Structures are given as structure tokens and as C-alpha cells.
């Protein structure tokens, strides 16, 4: 009954995080209401997406601030997100509550590869504290970290999004805010890209901000940090 | 009261496939008996991680017929896997039973993306027997993909080992054999490396066809292809 006879293709490049925690809501509502329109989806690193909507194999880019260096996209913000510490119930960070990132740098740490899923928050954060923390995993997906997690091999550290009670009820969560700064997903597409209706309604209702006025005023900017400055006034959601 | 007092580090290089449902088990074993060992594991790309040990920043390289048009490392067969086709239980692939790669064809795919887990034996599958598959998802991972089949995007291919009736109770799996080309899981190394009593023990106890003398003799021939033809006459494991 409440369908867009709308026909075009949607081109999607994005990360495992995205894709996992973040899109499926939103994908399911759209192959719904749009059913004429070819809906793909193309997991890979922040390079890569970066370079697909660059080389044009992709038509939008749904990462986490990691297309800068990259440029020619727009990018939009779309939400904050933070990480969480993963620990075995039987863990020292278990037991005393609820501090600091210098205590966190005393055990082996299990997280996110170099160059992905907002890693380069966590590197730094142990780099101006002075600090040179014993990594011995990098993963792209927390999936695979609280796997490893439960073997014991050392604490994990996620996107809290990654982690729910009802889906890892054996691990206990540890918010890492006021440790790590909060990770920004944008979405970037090149400014050449023709917005149909069914773009502007996928955008808006994967960031609620992002209206078809607020996108306009975005791309006529000509200017990825003019756009950030737009939302200075504004809490952007917080998954 | 059985642990080795052996001490040393041990760089591992892999991917999702192998770290998620082959290598858990592994490792839980190695860490217990070896507890003066710095485990180390590092997820990323097939191109990354034969880099990666070619680079000399990882010491053993685990995964499945990639690290080929590499190596320089030293290639060892570990077990042969398939695909399965994942489904939802409403769909007309559940209903005919249970043929072919035609009849696959003419729904959107959900699978790997190009260069990871052994998409290189489904899209030359295709192209042997002369059909253009519509693919509406590449992933990196069966967690997602498995998680797309259920919104009812497209047809799901992946590896047998990354569906569980237990842990996937609502997705149908299609045994795929017979369609495509089983994968081989092979691990390499620089020839360089020094090769201690652990790193036998956990070859061996990743593939129990490996042992000290079959590895010590497949190092010495100098030629992966030879190492090949060495375990010809020999059924490998089949994950």
C-alpha cells in the first residue's frame, strides 16, 4: 500500500561495524518502500570505499571519518558513537570500578586493526598520555574480538554499539567515554552524483538531520569542514 | 601441570574466515600450554597479510589460497572447505531440492567480496558456464551476509564452516559441493624464519598432517608447487 514506484540503482560502500550494527534497520525499511530500485551493498576497508565512490564503482560512502584524507566527496555527519571495554566476568577491570585509561595500558589489549573503525582515536589517546600499550590483536570486527575475549587472550575494546546484553550476555561492558574522544560516522558521495528522492530518503533516515534542505546547503558549500561547522549548534545522535 | 616453559613470541596473520570458526580452538590450546609465549593475532586483507609476513611484520600467514601470487613464504596445505547456500526458509531454493549453479544464478547474490575467502572459485565458476551473476552484496564476512539473507536482500553463499544449525537455527543451509571448487587453507612463512618447538606444535595441532619431519622436508624442497605434489597421495582435512 505504501510503496515509491521509483526506479534506479543504490550503490553502497561500507565497513563491517556499518553494515552490522548500524545499517540493517535502515536497509530493510528502504528495500521495502522502494522496490524498483536495485539496492547493493560493498563491504571493504575505509580505503577502499573511499576509492570506490572516488573511482565511482560506488555511489554513497557510509564510514567513520576515515575518507579524510580523501576528498571530492561531501561529507555528512551523520552520529557520534563511542567504545566499550570487554572483559571476562572474572577480570581485574571487572572488579574495581570504574576508571582509568593508565589502568587500561597494564593488560593486553584487543581491538580494532590500524586505519579502521575509529582505531587512531585509540592509538593517540595512549600516545599523549604517554603511554605504550601491549596489542595483541587487531581485528576489523568485534565479532572476532569478543571471541578472543572469552579465550582469555586479553581485554577487548569495541564500539559500544557492537556489544548487547541480549547477544553477549557472558561478557561484561565497561563505557570507555571520558577515555577515548567519540567517533563520527559520515556519509560521503561525489558532487557530480545526480540525489534522487529515494537518496535524500535513505540519507535522511539514516541521519534525521540530514533533510533534503540541510543536504542541498551541504553540497553548495563546496567544503567538508564548512559542513561540519553547519552542526556546531546541534547534538548529533548518539549510537 | 602440562605446560612447556618455552618462551618467545608468535606473529599471526589472518583473516576472518580462519580466525573466527577454524582458529578459536587453536589458539585456546596453544595459550594454556605455552604460557610464556606472546600470542600475537593480526585480521586484515589476503594482499595485506602475504605482505605482512613478506614485510617481516608477522612470522606465519593463515589463510585460504591467497597469499598466490605471493610467496616467497614457504605454502603448506592445511584442509580443504566448500560453500553453502544460505537462504530464508520461504524461499524457492528451499522449495527445489537440491540442484544447480543455473538455477542459482537467476537470483541476487550475497557472498564474498573479490580476493577474500575464495570468491575467486564462485565468479569463475560462473563464467566457466557462461552466466552473469547478479551480486547485491559483497561482504568480507558470513556474520553479515547471514545477516542480509534474513532481511530478504538475496541468495547467501559462504562457507560451510560459517554456518551452525545452533548458532544459525532460521537460515536453511544448501550444501554447494559439486558447484564450486573446494578452497584449500594453506599457511606460509618466510623461509627465513627459525622455526621453534611451538611453532611445530602449533602447525601440527592446526594440521595434523604437518608434522616435524613433513615440515622440516616440504621447507627444503624450495618450491611450493612441489609441496603440493607431496600431498597428492593424501586426503587433507575437510572443514
Known amino acids: 500500500e505504501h510503496t515509491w514506484p521509483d526506479k534506479?540503482?543504490?550503490?553502497?560502500?561500507?565497513?563491517?561495524?556499518?553494515?552490522?550494527?548500524?545499517?540493517?534497520?535502515?536497509i530493510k525499511g528502504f528495500i521495502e518502500r522502494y522496490p524498483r530500485v536495485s539496492l547493493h551493498m560493498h563491504q571493504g576497508s575505509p580505503t577502499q570505499i573511499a576509492e570506490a565512490v572516488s573511482k565511482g564503482n560506488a555511489d554513497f560512502a557510509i564510514a567513520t571519518e576515515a575518507l579524510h584524507l580523501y576528498d571530492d566527496l561531501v561529507m555528512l555527519p551523520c552520529y557520534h558513537w563511542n567504545r566499550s571495554i570487554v572483559v571476562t566476568p572474572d577480570h581485574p577491570l571487572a572488579a574495581?570500578?570504574?576508571?582509568?585509561?593508565?589502568?587500561?595500558?597494564?593488560?593486553?589489549?584487543?581491538?580494532?586493526?590500524?586505519?579502521?573503525?575509529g582505531r587512531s582515536e585509540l592509538d593517540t589517546a595512549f600516545?599523549?598520555?604517554?603511554?605504550?600499550?601491549?596489542?595483541?590483536?587487531?581485528?576489523?570486527?568485534?565479532?572476532?574480538?569478543?571471541?578472543?575475549?572469552?579465550?582469555?587472550?586479553?581485554?577487548?575494546?569495541?564500539?559500544?554499539?557492537?556489544?548487547?546484553?541480549?547477544?553477549?550476555?557472558?561478557?561484561?561492558?565497561?563505557?570507555?567515554?571520558?577515555?577515548?574522544?567519540?567517533?563520527?560516522?559520515?556519509?560521503?558521495?561525489?558532487?557530480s552524483t545526480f540525489?534522487?528522492?529515494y537518496m535524500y530518503?535513505?540519507?535522511?533516515?539514516?541521519?534525521?538531520?540530514?533533510?533534503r534542505d540541510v543536504v542541498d546547503t551541504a553540497v553548495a558549500l563546496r567544503s567538508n569542514e564548512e559542513i561540519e561547522a553547519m552542526f556546531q549548534d546541534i547534538k548529533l545522535p548518539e549510537k
Not at 534506479?8 to 535502515?26: D, E, F, K, M, N
Not at 593486553?108 to 573503525?117: D, Q, S
Not at 541480549?166 to 577515548?180: G, K, M, N, Q
Open 96 to 117: 574495581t570500578s570504574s576508571v582509568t585509561i593508565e589502568a587500561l595500558a597494564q593488560y593486553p589489549l584487543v581491538t580494532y586493526t590500524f586505519g579502521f573503525t
Open 195 to 197: 540525489l534522487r528522492s
Open 8 to 26: 534506479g540503482s543504490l550503490y553502497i560502500a561500507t565497513t563491517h561495524t556499518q553494515a552490522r550494527y548500524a545499517l540493517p534497520g535502515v
Open 127 to 191: 600516545n599523549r598520555a604517554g603511554l605504550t600499550p601491549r596489542i595483541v590483536f587487531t581485528a576489523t570486527d568485534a565479532d572476532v574480538i569478543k571471541t578472543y575475549v572469552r579465550l582469555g587472550l586479553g581485554v577487548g575494546v569495541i564500539a559500544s554499539m557492537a556489544v548487547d546484553p541480549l547477544a553477549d550476555p557472558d561478557l561484561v561492558r565497561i563505557d570507555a567515554h571520558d577515555i577515548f574522544s567519540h567517533s563520527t560516522t559520515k556519509i560521503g558521495f561525489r558532487r
Open 201 to 211: 530518503d535513505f540519507i535522511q533516515r539514516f541521519a534525521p538531520h540530514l533533510t
